[PDB]
Design an enzyme around this catalytic site. Structure first.
Site, PDB file in Angstrom:
ATOM      1  N   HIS A 111      35.375 -58.978  36.340  1.00  0.00           N
ATOM      2  CA  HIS A 111      36.457 -58.376  35.898  1.00  0.00           C
ATOM      3  C   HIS A 111      36.993 -58.946  34.453  1.00  0.00           C
ATOM      4  CE1 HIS A 111      40.501 -56.233  36.919  1.00  0.00           C
ATOM      5  NE2 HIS A 111      41.030 -57.364  35.680  1.00  0.00           N
ATOM      6  N   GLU A 112      37.139 -60.383  34.153  1.00  0.00           N
ATOM      7  CA  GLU A 112      37.405 -60.756  32.864  1.00  0.00           C
ATOM      8  C   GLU A 112      36.288 -60.553  31.805  1.00  0.00           C
ATOM      9  OE1 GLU A 112      40.413 -61.475  32.818  1.00  0.00           O
ATOM     10  OE2 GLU A 112      40.616 -61.774  35.042  1.00  0.00           O
ATOM     11  N   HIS A 133      36.856 -57.194  30.690  1.00  0.00           N
ATOM     12  CA  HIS A 133      38.160 -56.624  29.788  1.00  0.00           C
ATOM     13  C   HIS A 133      37.437 -57.120  28.378  1.00  0.00           C
ATOM     14  CE1 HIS A 133      41.471 -55.705  31.966  1.00  0.00           C
ATOM     15  NE2 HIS A 133      41.666 -56.722  33.032  1.00  0.00           N
ATOM     16  N   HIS A 174      41.817 -51.341  32.883  1.00  0.00           N
ATOM     17  CA  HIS A 174      41.982 -51.214  34.269  1.00  0.00           C
ATOM     18  C   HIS A 174      41.731 -49.997  34.812  1.00  0.00           C
ATOM     19  CE1 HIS A 174      44.563 -55.048  34.834  1.00  0.00           C
ATOM     20  NE2 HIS A 174      43.105 -55.421  34.917  1.00  0.00           N
TER      21      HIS A 174
HETATM   22  C1  LIG Z   1      38.292 -59.047  40.597  1.00  0.00           C
HETATM   23  O1  LIG Z   1      39.238 -60.241  39.919  1.00  0.00           O
HETATM   24  C2  LIG Z   1      40.526 -59.729  39.639  1.00  0.00           C
HETATM   25  C3  LIG Z   1      40.923 -58.410  39.650  1.00  0.00           C
HETATM   26  C4  LIG Z   1      42.223 -57.632  39.013  1.00  0.00           C
HETATM   27  C5  LIG Z   1      43.121 -58.793  38.610  1.00  0.00           C
HETATM   28  C6  LIG Z   1      42.655 -60.082  38.582  1.00  0.00           C
HETATM   29  C7  LIG Z   1      41.370 -60.637  38.964  1.00  0.00           C
HETATM   30  C8  LIG Z   1      43.920 -60.946  37.972  1.00  0.00           C
HETATM   31  O2  LIG Z   1      43.940 -61.911  37.841  1.00  0.00           O
HETATM   32  N1  LIG Z   1      44.726 -60.076  37.878  1.00  0.00           N
HETATM   33  C9  LIG Z   1      46.169 -60.318  36.928  1.00  0.00           C
HETATM   34  C10 LIG Z   1      45.853 -60.270  35.388  1.00  0.00           C
HETATM   35  C11 LIG Z   1      46.872 -60.672  34.469  1.00  0.00           C
HETATM   36  C12 LIG Z   1      47.013 -59.907  33.286  1.00  0.00           C
HETATM   37  C13 LIG Z   1      48.177 -59.988  32.309  1.00  0.00           C
HETATM   38  C14 LIG Z   1      49.169 -61.129  32.763  1.00  0.00           C
HETATM   39  C15 LIG Z   1      49.967 -61.726  31.750  1.00  0.00           C
HETATM   40  C16 LIG Z   1      50.505 -60.655  30.786  1.00  0.00           C
HETATM   41  C17 LIG Z   1      51.648 -61.010  30.003  1.00  0.00           C
HETATM   42  C18 LIG Z   1      52.267 -62.325  30.088  1.00  0.00           C
HETATM   43  N2  LIG Z   1      51.702 -63.246  31.056  1.00  0.00           N
HETATM   44  C19 LIG Z   1      50.744 -62.911  31.820  1.00  0.00           C
HETATM   45  C20 LIG Z   1      48.973 -61.949  33.828  1.00  0.00           C
HETATM   46  C21 LIG Z   1      47.809 -61.733  34.693  1.00  0.00           C
HETATM   47  N3  LIG Z   1      44.549 -60.806  34.924  1.00  0.00           N
HETATM   48  C22 LIG Z   1      43.577 -59.862  34.627  1.00  0.00           C
HETATM   49  O3  LIG Z   1      42.405 -60.040  34.067  1.00  0.00           O
HETATM   50  N4  LIG Z   1      43.976 -58.626  34.864  1.00  0.00           N
HETATM   51  C23 LIG Z   1      45.333 -58.628  35.303  1.00  0.00           C
HETATM   52  O4  LIG Z   1      46.035 -57.665  35.436  1.00  0.00           O
HETATM   53  C24 LIG Z   1      44.504 -58.493  37.997  1.00  0.00           C
HETATM   54 ZN   LIG Z   2      42.595 -57.070  34.491  1.00  0.00          ZN
END
Ligand SMILES: COc1ccc2c(c1)C(=O)[N+](C[C@@]1(c3ccc(-c4cccnc4)cc3)NC(=O)NC1=O)=C2
Ligand SMILES: [Zn+2]
Length: 258
Positions: A189-190, A193, A199
């Protein structure tokens, strides 16, 4: 002699003191093995995806270098480092604010990140609200402010160039170690991005199927568990976005598979 194919995004993988202790059991071999196997399984997902649903396949990732940080970084007062013992901004919390941690890792790893397609930090901290990772989003544009291929952005405070070709993965969530199948998806996922995918939106059924249709794809905004067939795959939405980024950027920093 076959023509050279710049199709591999080479990675600098960093395991901080938290990962080394809680995942690597305080051992170099255990730390190394976990990361090598994880990257290879994530590579099977990328390398096997036909980005344009035709012949634009064989594009993946390989570890270039592994940096293991066995001990916390000693810091002077008011000084911070992504590998310091304490969480920042709040030392009382188990984890850093995720956005500040990514910014800090990018600042501290800059000189090393300038030499690789992507830098990725592996940590062991329980981020708030079920967050498992964070990365700078890539794109086909030369001034993307993130993702695949290092581009220098000067830091006036640090008096140095910093790079946004970074991401991080935590293998800790809700006080426990996540399953390896969950950890593989977080890094997928990372890097997703970093490779230019956004998304998957609910408004495009094709990119967000129901559970009886194989479930959600890897870029769904609510973290996939890996229990469903689509979980470990990119949607057609992610494929189109990533295809555009790779097409433009593979000639910039991708290399031959080693
Ligand atoms: C399959 O693994 C994943 C799938 C979907 C996601 C993740 C992991 C994950 O950590 N997340 C959260 C998440 C995220 C994004 C922004 C912020 C943020 C923005 C502004 C200020 N502070 C923080 C925090 C978490 N990390 C990611 O890669 N996407 C997100 O939506 C969705
Ligand atoms: Zn994400």
């Amino acid at each position: 002699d076959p023509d050279p194919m710049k199709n591999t995004c080479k990675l600098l993988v960093v395991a901080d003191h938290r990962f080394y202790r809680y995942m690597g059991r305080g051992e170099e071999s255990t730390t190394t093995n976990y990361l090598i196997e994880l990257i290879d399984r994530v590579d099977d997902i990328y390398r096997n995806t036909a980005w344009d649903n035709a012949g634009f396949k064989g594009y993946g990732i390989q570890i270039e270098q592994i940096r293991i940080l066995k001990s916390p970084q000693e810091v002077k007062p008011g000084e911070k480092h992504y590998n310091m013992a304490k969480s920042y901004p709040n030392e009382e919390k188990d984890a850093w604010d995720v956005k500040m941690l990514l910014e800090q890792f990018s600042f501290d790893i800059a000189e090393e990140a300038s030499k690789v397609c992507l830098a990725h930090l592996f940590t062991y901290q329980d981020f708030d609200m079920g967050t498992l990772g964070l990365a700078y989003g890539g794109s086909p544009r030369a001034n993307s402010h993130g993702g695949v291929c290092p581009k220098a952005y000067y830091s006036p405070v640090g008096k140095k160039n910093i790079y946004l070709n970074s991401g991080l993965t935590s293998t800790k969530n809700y006080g426990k170690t996540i399953l390896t199948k969950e950890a593989d998806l977080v890094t997928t996922h990372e890097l997703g991005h970093n490779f230019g995918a956004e998304h998957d939106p609910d408004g495009l059924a094709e990119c967000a199927p129901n559970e009886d249709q194989g479930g959600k794809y890897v870029m769904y905004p609510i973290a996939v568990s890996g229990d469903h067939e689509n979980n470990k795959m990119f949607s057609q939405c992610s494929k189109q976005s990533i295809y555009k980024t790779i097409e433009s950027k593979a000639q910039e920093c991708f290399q031959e598979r080693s």
